[PDB]
């Protein structure tokens, strides 16, 4: 069974370096080229680098050329990406992928005139990727553990529609993941949705938790969002009240 498996991923500070390792199996590794394709989740696919089956030709994307480096060890069915001078914008899920073009070497190095050595075929990749690995995650942040600042997404006339009001909590600037949010100690679960976290250029995560409720209840019912960040050992409780100065929304009391 054909398999590609990556490894080396993890959280790493910018400026530093990191080596990923792709292990190939289920086919003749020394007959195919290899590529690294990354994907900022879920911003789409970006091609990083590629190597010819003999290891003679190296290709690099404009975003990484000069900083990153590729190589392969056919004796180990391995395939490496040496990342240097890491940038916060290098954060992505890194896939290793096999090159489409199957080639048989037709030019080796004979290290002594009695016998063999590395293949040296000058060719030559196709540029199409017919096998993919599971991908290994590479997060780049200079941040250490930090607790969140919780801000209210107050309900207003611009969040109500059809007798259903929308309110939430902005959980800003924390690290690392995760952050679990609840509403009224878990009494309120209907209409609640907590969105995926967002990694800012600052190096910190942010997310929002929103809940939908009867617009008429805003004047009597009380809504507290319960943010929880165990990494920094923090529990914030923010009471969200309707927008202060809003004509377009009537509220009891």
């Amino acid at each position: 069974e054909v398999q590609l498996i990556e490894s080396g991923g993890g959280v790493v500070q910018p400026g530093r370096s990191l080596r990923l390792s792709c292990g190939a199996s289920g086919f003749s590794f020394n007959n195919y080229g290899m590529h690294w394709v990354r994907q900022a989740p879920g911003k789409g696919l970006e091609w990083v680098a590629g190597i010819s089956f003999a290891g003679i030709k190296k290709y690099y994307g404009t975003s990484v050329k000069g900083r990153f480096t590729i190589s392969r060890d056919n004796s180990k069915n391995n395939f490496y990406l040496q990342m240097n001078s890491l940038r916060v914008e290098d954060t992505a899920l890194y896939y290793c992928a096999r090159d489409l073009r199957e080639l048989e070497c037709e030019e080796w190095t004979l290290y002594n005139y009695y016998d063999r050595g590395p293949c040296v075929d000058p060719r030559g990749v196709a540029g199409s990727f017919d096998v993919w690995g599971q991908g290994t995650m590479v997060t780049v942040s200079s941040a250490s553990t930090k607790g969140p600042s919780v801000f209210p997404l107050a309900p207003s006339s611009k969040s109500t529609s059809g007798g259903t009001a929308a309110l939430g909590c902005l959980v800003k600037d924390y690290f690392p993941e995760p952050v679990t949010v609840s509403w009224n100690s878990g009494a309120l679960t209907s209409g609640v949705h907590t969105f995926p976290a967002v990694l800012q250029s600052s190096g910190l995560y942010s997310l929002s938790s929103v809940v939908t409720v009867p617009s008429s209840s805003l004047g009597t019912q009380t809504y507290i969002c319960n943010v929880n960040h165990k990494p920094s050992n923090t529990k914030v409780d923010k009471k969200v009240e309707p927008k202060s100065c809003d004509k377009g929304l009537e509220v009891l009391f």
Partner: protein, 211 residues
């Protein structure tokens, strides 16, 4: 990050036929072959088409490709539920490695739902922290694909934006979020900011201003 342009999303009912388009520079697609990949949600991509119109031993007759000039096209007949994914076009131009944006193909499994867009201004509390963040929340919509865009006094904004991809809700519909990070100066020194959400050709636009 040089890139080939694709449509954001297309959708059709089980059994119908879809067409997806690529397009780009002549020094890229004008002179080189094109490939197509399928990326089911949560898993790695998978080659569907190579050399413009060749199918690998393992992809059905249903998928087909065709290139002409500076444009390329992927087509899927007899849609099955398991065809729901993102589709990327790609080309190799020597140094090579150029993907599409690309396109999500949704196979409708429920009634289309229009998004309820809610835009929040920065809290005075946050402004006291000499910072500002506009939070645009998109809720209750299907198919689960959108395109958010921010504007300042009806002028495009690109820097300081981060958008999450749509995620399933408890009611099996989708929701998404977008954040525009400002300084309190920018926030107050503009007449209005607006969050423009596009969903199935339709575009909703909410607006907010200082106090």
């Amino acid at each position: 990050q040089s890139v080939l342009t694709q449509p954001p999303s297309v959708s059709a009912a089980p059994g119908q036929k879809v067409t997806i388009s690529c397009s780009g520079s002549t020094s890229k697609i004008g002179q080189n072959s094109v490939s197509w990949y399928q990326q089911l949600p949560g898993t790695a991509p998978k080659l569907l088409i190579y050399e413009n119109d060749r199918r690998p031993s393992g992809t059905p007759d249903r998928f087909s490709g065709s290139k002409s000039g500076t444009s390329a096209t992927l087509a899927i007949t007899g849609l099955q539920t398991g065809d729901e994914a993102e589709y990327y076009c790609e080309t190799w131009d020597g140094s090579g490695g150029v993907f599409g944006t690309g396109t999500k193909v949704t196979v409708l499994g429920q009634p289309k739902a229009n998004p309820t867009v809610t835009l929040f201004p920065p809290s005075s509390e946050e402004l006291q922290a000499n910072k500002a963040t506009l939070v645009c929340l998109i809720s209750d919509f299907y198919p689960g694909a959108v395109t958010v865009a921010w504007k300042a006094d009806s002028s495009p904004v690109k820097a300081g934006v981060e958008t999450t991809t749509p995620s399933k809700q408890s009611n099996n519909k989708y929701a998404a979020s977008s954040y525009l990070s400002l300084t309190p100066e920018q926030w107050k020194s503009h007449r209005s900011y607006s969050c423009q959400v596009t969903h199935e050709g339709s575009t909703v636009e909410k607006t907010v201003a200082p106090t």
